[PDB]
């Protein structure tokens, strides 16, 4: 089947994004940075390791549900088109493509991510594995290009791994409304959400003893050093995995050991950390089963299936327009 890659991000859309977020976030109280900057190539290789740590259940837990329920997903949604908000490199992507193909209905695949080079490699791979699938890959972001996803057929939009947990409730409803807004009736969304559980287990999942997560968190300082010509003393920031009980969310902070004075050249800006000051680099919202379905409803989607792993750790929702 034919490939297409359509690119809607400027050649430097990523750099200007990085300059804006760092400039704004290094000047607020407390300092905060978006988590999307974790995922350069070094960072992406660290995230590949996190998914295989014993402490980090979410990848395994979702995998278990999908290894069991992918057929039922394909049966209930009847889609001929799989749209992934994500790069399409997962094993779980092949689970869902397998289900639609086994159902005799796999006609089209639409990966939707921001790195065109990842999309082009994904399309090549999928096009070799699945004869007779059209791979319409889209390079864009959620804030402006969800309308660039192709029309027609019955579409299953997929957004796994509790990625939506990276969105606090304000931006989260703003995303679900936009997505449901581009969905046609008969389309359906598959959404993974990590569930509230024992806080001791939540905190260990985000601070593994060897510190693979610690390097992942600190890696944000390396990306800023390199792409904005800053001088973070990366070794003098400490990984801190916090449980925010009232918002029911994990938080990833960097605590500054000793007063730091960092200068980001490309921005012509100097920031200051007091000794022990902590910067927010991620939130990882955990969910309750009723609150997920209710939130889907606010956006105009009606959950028809909810699915849990054998242990109750992770939830997969299937909702229709
Ligand atoms: O929330 C998560 O556990 C991860 C990020 C992360 C893993 N360990 C520390 N941070 N994730 C998954 C989708 C989007 C972010």
Domain boundaries along the sequence of the chain:
1-11+57-197+287-321, 12-56+198-286
Tokens of 38: 């974790």
Residue 86, marked binder: yes
Tell me which H or E stretch contains 61. Answer: helix 58-77
To test the ligand 1 pocket, which listed residue (59, 165, 284) has its Cβ within 8 A of the most ligand atoms? 284
Beta strand extents in 41-126 (DSSP E only): 81-85, 108-113
* Structure-token match 């088109």, residue found: 81
Strands (DSSP E) found in the chain = 3-7, 81-85, 108-113, 134-139, 155-159, 188-194, 237-244, 249-256, 260-264, 269-273, 278-285, 302-308, 314-320
Distance (Å, whole) CA 279 – CA 38: 14
Resolution of the structure, angstroms: 2.7
Sign of CA dihedral 111, 112, 114, 120: positive
CB 178 within 8 A of CB 46: no
Is residue 40 part of an annotated ligand binding site? no
Q: Is 307 in the pocket of ligand 1 (CB under 6 A)?
A: no
Cβ contacts of 165-170, under 8 Å, gap ≥ 24: 165/193, 165/194, 165/249, 165/283, 165/284, 165/285, 165/286, 165/287, 166/35, 166/282, 166/283, 166/284, 166/285, 167/285, 168/247, 168/249, 168/283, 168/285, 169/285
**Angstrom distances, CA of residue 86 to CA of 1, 160, 163, 298, 314:** 21, 9, 9, 23, 19
Q: Kindly provide the b/e burial profile for residues 19-28, where b requires at least 16 CB atoms within 10 angstroms of the residue's own CB.
A: bebbbebbee
Instruction: Specify the experimental method.
Output: X-ray
Q: What is the largest CA-CA distance in the chain?
A: 62
Per-residue tokens: 5: 């890659």
According to DSSP, residue 148 is labeled: G
The candidate with the shortest Cα–Cα distance to 126, out of 101, 156, 104, is 101
CB 128, CB 97: distance < 8 Å? no
* Spacing, Cα 217 to ligand 1 middle (Å): 10
- The answer for residues whose C-beta is within 8 angstroms of residue 76's C-beta and 6 or more apart is 188, 304, 305, 318
Measured from the CA of 205, which atom of ligand 1 is nearest? 8
Task: Quote the CA–CA distance of 103 and 76 in Å, as a whole number.
Answer: 11
Nearest atom (ligand 1) to Cα of 250: 1
């Amino acid at each position: 089947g034919p490939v297409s890659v359509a690119n809607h991000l400027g050649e430097d859309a990523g750099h200007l994004a990085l300059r804006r977020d760092v400039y704004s976030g290094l000047q607020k109280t407390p300092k905060s940075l978006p988590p999307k900057w974790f995922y350069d190539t070094v960072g992406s290789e660290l995230f590949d390791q996190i998914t295989r740590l014993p402490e980090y259940y979410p990848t395994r837990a979702e995998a278990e549900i999908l290894r069991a329920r992918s057929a039922e997903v394909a049966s209930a949604c009847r889609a001929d088109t799989l749209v992934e908000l994500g790069s399409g490199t997962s094993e779980k992507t092949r689970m869902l493509l397998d289900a639609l193909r086994h159902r005799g209905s796999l006609r089209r695949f639409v990966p939707f991510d921001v790195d065109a080079s990842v999309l082009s490699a994904t399309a090549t791979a999928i096009q070799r594995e699945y004869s007779g699938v059209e791979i319409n890959a889209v390079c864009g972001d959620f804030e402006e290009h969800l309308t660039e996803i192709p029309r027609g057929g019955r579409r299953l939009f997929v957004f796994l791994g509790s990625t939506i947990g990276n969105l606090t409730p304000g931006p989260r409803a703003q995303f679900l409304t936009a997505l449901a807004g581009v969905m046609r009736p008969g389309d359906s969304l598959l959404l993974g959400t990590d569930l509230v559980k024992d806080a001791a287990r939540l905190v260990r999942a985000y601070d593994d003893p060897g510190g693979v997560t610690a390097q992942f968190n600190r890696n944000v300082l390396a990306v800023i050093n390199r792409e904005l010509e800053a001088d973070f003393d990366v070794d003098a920031f400490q990984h801190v995995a916090r449980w925010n009980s009232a918002e029911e969310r994990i938080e990833m902070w960097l605590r500054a050991d000793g007063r730091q004075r960092v200068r980001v050249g490309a921005l012509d800006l100097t920031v200051d950390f007091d000794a022990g000051e902590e910067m927010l680099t991620e939130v990882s919202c955990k969910f309750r089963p009723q609150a997920v379905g209710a939130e889907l409803a606010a956006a105009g989607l009606h959950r028809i299936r909810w699915w849990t792993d054998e242990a109750g750790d992770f939830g997969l929702s299937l909702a229709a327009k």
